[PDB]
Amino acid sequence: FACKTANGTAIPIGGGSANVYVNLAPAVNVGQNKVVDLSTQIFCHNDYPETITDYVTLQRGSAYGGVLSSFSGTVKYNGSSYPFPTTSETPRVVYNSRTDKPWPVALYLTPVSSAGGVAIKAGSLIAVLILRQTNNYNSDDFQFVWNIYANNDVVVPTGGHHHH
Amino acid sequence: GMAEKEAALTAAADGTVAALAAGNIGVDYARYRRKALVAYAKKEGLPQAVIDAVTARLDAAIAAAEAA
C-alpha cells in the first residue's frame, strides 16, 4: 500500500504520524458544510499486487484536530456517510492493482453557528485520521496515523453563510 | 509457475528495502511487510532459500533504519 498527494509528494506509510498536506475547499450546504474532499488530494495503490492484496479501513477515533478539535460532523467513505469523530470502523477498500485510485474520503462539519467560520492558516493541523491495513495471507494488521494539514489559508464556515 | 511467483516475491522485497531507504515507509510497516511476504512465500510454496535471502536483506534494511 502506497499513496501520494496531488502534487506527487509520497505519503510515508507507518513510522510515526505522517503529515499529509492537502488543499481545503470548503462548501456551505444546508445543515452540512464540506471541509475537504480528500479524493482529489490523495491517491493510493498496491505497489506489488502479485504478492499480497491490501485491505484498508478508516479506524474509530478519527477526528478533527488543531483549531477544529471541538467540531463534529460527517465523513463520506466510499459512497456512505458515517459520524465524525468515527465511532465504528469503516468498510474496507481493496487495493489489488498498481492503478492509482482516489482515496474516497471527504470530511464535513455540522453547522453550530449562524455565520461563523474558523481561520485556517497553511500548516495548520485539521484532522487526525487513523487507518488500518489487513491482507489476504495472514490475520495481521497494521495501524497508522495521517495528520491532515492545510496547505492553504482558508476560512472554514461553521454556519449557513458564504464568507466574501 | 513458481519462478514467476519468486520474481514477484523478490521485486516486492526489493521495493520494501527501497521504500525504507527512501523513508517512504516506517520500520513498523517494513516489519509488517516482511511478515506478510513470508506468509505469501509459504502459502505459495516458494523455495526456503529464496525466503531466507529475502528475509536477510529486509532484516539488514530494518536494522539500518532503526540506527538512523
Numbering used by the authors:
A (entry chain B): 1 to 164
B (entry chain A): 1 to 68
Paper text:
Uropathogenic E. coli (UPEC) expresses type 1 pili, a prototypical CUP pilus, which are tipped with the mannose binding adhesin FimH. FimH consists of an N-terminal mannose-binding lectin domain and a C-terminal pilin domain that attaches to the rest of the pilus. In the LAS, the body of the FimH lectin domain interacts with the pilin domain, fixing it in place, and allosterically disrupts the mannose binding pocket, resulting in a low affinity for mannose. In the HAS, the lectin domain has little to no interaction with the pilin domain, allowing it to rotate freely relative to the pilin domain, and the mannose binding pocket loops are stably positioned to bind to mannose. The third binding loop, which is known as the “clamp” loop, is dynamic relative to the stable pocket loops in the LAS but attached to them in the HAS, functioning as a molecular latch that stabilizes the pocket when mannose is present and when interactions between the pilin and lectin domains are disrupted under shear force. LAS binders were likely ranked higher by AF2 metrics because the wider binding pocket of the LAS conformation exposed more hydrophobic residues than that of the HAS.
In this study we show that de novo protein design tools can be employed to design potent and specific minibinder inhibitors of bacterial adhesins, virulence factors critical for colonization and biofilm formation in a broad range of bacterial infections, including UPEC UTI and A. baumannii CAUTI. Among the diverse family of bacterial adhesins, chaperone-usher pathway (CUP) pili adhesins lie at the tips of extracellular fibers, and recognize receptors in a lectin-substrate interaction that mediates host and tissue tropisms. To investigate this, we sought to design minibinders against three CUP adhesins: FimH from Escherichia coli, which accounts for 70–90% of UTIs, and Abp1D and Abp2D from Acinetobacter baumannii, which is prevalent in hospital-acquired CAUTIs and is often multidrug resistant. Being able to specifically target minibinders to the substrate binding epitope using RFdiffusion with hotspot conditioning led to neutralizing binders without the need for antibody screening or knowledge of the native substrates.
